């Protein structure tokens, strides 16, 4: 089954030559791209043909950190302002009322926002399982909306009966965690090229569980070929806690647990030291940059430019909607460029460097070689922005930079795994007005 995107004003490929093709054309069969180029690919009819004049086509953005259940709890009044301590203490007793239907809908809500703002692959970090919630419920929602999903079995063990902050209803026994995590891997992990569903193992933070679960998790992930994800060094407290309790820097504590390698990626890394950047570069460890979260939570300016210069694989993440509180992937791309410039100078990040993090960087951090750019044999994952909107008026001097320097609206078109999921700005895979409405009634229900 064939799909032809023809005569885009600018087809950004992100391929090995970083081709930016004027009048560029894209030919798809099934889930993969057959060729990127020009009018040469239009001479035969295709089962579907979509004119893309006046549009920029880019590879689909890849979101590499999230907490989609938190899209049910944005701007909770008690949590909008204050210290991360009050943030957790105010939000945990609420999240203790999450029901499996809420995980299933809240996955689609968060996913719809990312998709309409240009994202074709996302991870999630669901690490709470009250009232019979399961990673399966999140997966059911991802399958319905058609997004490429990296589901993380997040976990927590240290609750209030062990000196921790999470209530006891929101922690679990480490043996039950390893057993659910292995059941999830066996039931959902597709390791083949163009997989639409993959599992990674992901304790919430190296301090939310025992060191034994950190090591046992990595052993299991290595045995099964899945990735490892966690929160690492997102603020000053993280650094102090690691030095005070384990006498190590967060990077050193990470290396010590086996949690380095191209099958690992750490979220935030705002306070990664120079030695930790060197370590992550030579072992291939990835970082998920969450610039809006780092600002909205007063975490800091991660040394992203320092990491890229030294060779670190960096992807982009919006983080949970209680710590952003938006899910706008292209705006997060914009934000990474703005925040890097104000922290490190007028040469710290341009439009193409940001967009590369949001595409190739995310694929690398998720340990995937089949997404992130547009070339023969790659997954058919791309979006298209209308260039004649008011938002981009006067910015056609560079359609690629226009997306990062201006604030565009929704994408016009989106193709995930070869399937046209957004047409003229309308989500095709779900009844979006109905899901949004349902989402808001559960959020009202969850909060009261």
The interface with a second copy within residues 83-102 (CB under 8 A) comprises 83-84
Candidates 45, 163, 247, 394: give the one binding a second copy (CB under 8 A): 394
Q: Rounded to the nearest whole angstrom, what is the least distance from the CB of residue 200 to a second copy in the complex?
A: 25
Q: Rounded to the nearest whole angstrom, what is the least distance from the CB of residue 14 to Zn ion in the complex?
A: 26
Tell me the angle at which helices 135-145 and 174-188 cross, rounded to the nearest 10 degrees: 30
Q: Rounded to the nearest whole angstrom, what is the least distance from the CB of residue 317 to Zn ion in the complex?
A: 8
Q: Could you tell me how far CA 151 lies from the centroid of its own chain?
A: 10
Nearer to Zn ion (CB atom), residue 9 or residue 319: 319
Nearer to a second copy (CB atom), residue 224 or residue 237: 237
Nearer to Zn ion (CB atom), residue 290 or residue 392: 290
Separation CA 67–CA 382 (nearest Å): 24
Task: For residue 19, state whether it binds a second copy (rule: CB under 8 A).
Answer: no
Residue 393 binding target from a second copy, Zn ion, none, CB below 5 to 8 Å by type:
a second copy
Task: For residue 425, state whether it binds a second copy (rule: CB under 8 A).
Answer: no
Q: Rounded to the nearest whole angstrom, what is the least distance from the CB of residue 67 to Zn ion in the complex?
A: 5
Which residues make up the interface to Zn ion (CB under 5 A)? 319
Q: Rounded to the nearest whole angstrom, what is the least distance from the CB of residue 208 to a second copy in the complex?
A: 21
Q: Rounded to the nearest whole angstrom, what is the least distance from the CB of residue 442 to a second copy in the complex?
A: 9
Separation CA 125–CA 429 (nearest Å): 23
Task: For residue 430, state whether it binds a second copy (rule: CB under 8 A).
Answer: no
Separation CA 267–CA 271 (nearest Å): 11
For 54, counting Cβ atoms within 10 Å of its Cβ (0-12 exposed, 13-18 middle, 19+ buried), the class is middle
Nearest alpha-carbon partner for 304 in 256, 262, 337, 261: 337
Torsions phi, psi of 416, nearest 5? -125, 125
Residue 331 binding target from Zn ion, a second copy, none, CB below 5 to 8 Å by type:
a second copy
Nearest alpha-carbon partner for 235 in 281, 291, 302, 280: 302
Give the torsion through C-alpha atoms of 303, 65, 257, 139, to 10 deg.
Answer: -170
Residue 341 binding target from Zn ion, a second copy, none, CB below 5 to 8 Å by type:
a second copy
Report the DSSP beta bridge partners of residue 35: 27
Residues 265-324 that bind a second copy (CB under 8 A): 292, 294-301, 321, 324
Tokens of 441: 């009634």
The residue whose Cβ lies closest to Zn ion is: 319
Nearest alpha-carbon partner for 340 in 309, 383, 363: 309
Q: ω into residue 325 within 30 of 0, thus cis?
A: yes
Residue 298 binding target from a second copy, Zn ion, none, CB below 5 to 8 Å by type:
a second copy
Q: Rounded to the nearest whole angstrom, what is the least distance from the CB of residue 135 to a second copy in the complex?
A: 20
In what side-by-side order are the strands of the sheet with 55-59?
Answer: 20-21, 10-12, 55-59, 382-386, 413-416, 419-423, 426-427
For 39, 130, 162, 358, the CA distances from 1, given in Å and listed in that order, are 20, 43, 56, 29
Task: For residue 61, state whether it binds a second copy (rule: CB under 8 A).
Answer: no
Residue count (the chain): 448
Residue 183 binding target from Zn ion, a second copy, none, CB below 5 to 8 Å by type:
none
For 128, 198, 201, 243, 325, the CA distances from 156, given in Å and listed in that order, are 7, 21, 12, 21, 23
Q: Which residues contact 440 (CB under 8 A, 6 or more apart)?
A: none
Residue 258 binding target from Zn ion, a second copy, none, CB below 5 to 8 Å by type:
none
Residue 13 binding target from a second copy, Zn ion, none, CB below 5 to 8 Å by type:
none
Q: Which stretch binds a second copy (CB under 8 A): 164-172, 252-260, 416-424, 439-447?
A: 439-447
Task: For residue 402, state whether it binds a second copy (rule: CB under 8 A).
Answer: yes
Task: For residue 395, state whether it binds a second copy (rule: CB under 8 A).
Answer: yes
Residue 319 binding target from Zn ion, a second copy, none, CB below 5 to 8 Å by type:
Zn ion
Q: Which stretch binds a second copy (CB under 8 A): 145-153, 185-193, 360-368, 438-446?
A: 438-446
Buried b (16+ CB within 10 A) or exposed e, 110-131: bbbbbbbbbbbbbbbbbbbbbe
The site that binds a second copy (CB under 8 A) totals a number of residues, namely 72
Residues 330-369: x where in contact with a second copy by CB under 8 A, - otherwise, as a string: -x---x-xxx-xx-xxxxx-xx------------------
Q: Return the sign of the alpha-carbon dihedral for residues 158, 160, 163, 165.
A: positive
Q: Which stretch binds a second copy (CB under 8 A): 56-64, 72-80, 281-289, 306-314?
A: 72-80
Task: For residue 116, state whether it binds a second copy (rule: CB under 8 A).
Answer: yes
């Amino acid at each position: 089954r064939t799909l032809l995107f023809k005569n885009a004003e600018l087809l950004v490929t992100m391929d090995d030559e970083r081709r930016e093709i004027r009048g560029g054309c894209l030919l798809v069969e099934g889930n993969r791209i057959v060729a990127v180029g020009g009018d040469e690919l239009c001479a035969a009819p295709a089962d579907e043909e979509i004119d893309l004049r006046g549009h920029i086509v880019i590879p689909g953005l890849i979101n590499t950190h999230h907490h989609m259940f938190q899209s049910l709890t944005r701007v909770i009044p008690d949590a909008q302002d204050g210290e991360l301590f009050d943030w957790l203490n105010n939000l945990y007793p609420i999240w203790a009322g999450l029901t499996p239907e809420m995980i299933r809908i809240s996955t689609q809500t968060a996913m719809a926002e990312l998709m309409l703002s240009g994202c074709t692959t996302s991870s999630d970090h669901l690490y709470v399982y009250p009232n019979g919630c399961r990673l399966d419920d999140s997966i059911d929602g991802a399958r319905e909306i058609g997004m490429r999903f990296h589901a993380c079995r997040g976990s927590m063990s240290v609750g209030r009966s062990k000196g921790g902050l999470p209530p006891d209803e929101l922690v679990e026994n480490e043996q039950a965690i390893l057993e659910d995590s292995l059941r999830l891997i066996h039931s959902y992990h597709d390791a083949q090229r163009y997989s639409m569903l993959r599992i990674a193992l992901a304790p919430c933070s190296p301090f939310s569980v025992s060191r034994e679960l950190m090591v046992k998790t990595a052993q299991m992930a290595r045995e099964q070929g899945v990735s490892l994800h966690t929160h690492l060094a997102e603020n000053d407290s993280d650094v102090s806690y690691s030095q005070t309790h384990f006498g190590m820097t967060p990077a050193q504590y990470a290396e010590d647990l086996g949690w380095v390698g191209s099958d690992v990626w750490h979220a935030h890394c705002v306070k990664l030291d120079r030695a930790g950047i060197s370590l992550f570069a030579r072992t291939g460890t990835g970082v998920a940059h969450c610039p809006c979260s780092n600002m909205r939570l007063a975490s800091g300016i991660a040394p992203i430019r320092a990491m890229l210069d030294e060779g670190v694989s960096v992807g982009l993440g919006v983080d949970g909607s209680a710590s952003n509180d938006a899910g706008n992937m292209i705006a997060e791309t914009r934000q990474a460029m703005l925040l890097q410039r104000v922290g490190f100078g007028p040469d710290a990040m341009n439009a193409r460097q940001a967009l590369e993090i949001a595409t190739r960087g995310g694929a690398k951090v998720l340990n995937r070689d089949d997404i992130g750019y547009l070339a023969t044999g790659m997954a058919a994952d791309f979006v298209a922005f209308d260039l004649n909107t008011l938002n981009l008026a006067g910015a056609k001097h560079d359609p690629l930079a226009a997306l990062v320097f201006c604030t565009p609206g929704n994408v016009a078109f989106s193709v995930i795994n070869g399937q046209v999921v957004i047409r003229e700005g309308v989500l095709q895979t779900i009844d979006l007005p109905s899901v949004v409405q349902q989402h808001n009634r559960l959020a009202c229900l969850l909060v009261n």
